Amino acid sequence: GAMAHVFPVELMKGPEGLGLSIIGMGVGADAGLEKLGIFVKTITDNGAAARDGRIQVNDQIIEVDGKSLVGVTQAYAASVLRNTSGLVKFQIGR
Amino acid sequence: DSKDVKEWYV
Ligand SMILES: [Cl-]
Ligand SMILES: [Zn+2]
């Protein structure tokens, strides 16, 4: 459709993490490390995100546990994601 | 360049 698809995903973190990898997309003209959006590059077989089944490669992780992942460094985003624990709440874009 | 940056695992 012509409109963005944004949806919530809640899942339980696994012992080996969320089970996905992230990349940034988009920068400012200053060329510093801030990324405009954060996107899923890979999903780990048998990991929490794979088992849940909803999140896909090239989905955007817009927000996690109330923390925006818009206009943030890749390191910041990954750190937020790594600090999740137990139930994790996402806003996902497609 | 951004195009060769490594993905971060979480
Ligand atoms: Cl994002
Ligand atoms: Zn590069």
Author numbering:
A (entry chain A): 1254 to 1347
B (entry chain B): 1831 to 1840
Q: Which of the paper's sentences describe this entry?
A:
together, we show that loss of Spn affects the synaptic structure of the NMJ. excessive seeding of new AZ scaffolds at the NMJ. sets the threshold for AZ assembly.
eliminated after deleting the last five amino acids of the Nrx-1 C terminus. Spn-PDZ domain at atomic resolution, we turned to X-ray crystallography. chain/main chain hydrogen bonding to β2 of the Spn-PDZ. side chains of Spn-PDZ residues residing on β4 and α2. interaction that might be important for stabilizing the peptide conformation. domains of Spn or Syd-1 using isothermal calorimetry (ITC). binding the Nrx-1 C terminus with micromolar affinity via its PDZ domain. intracellular C-term of Nrx-1 at the atomic level. strictly dependent on the ligand-binding integrity of this PDZ domain.
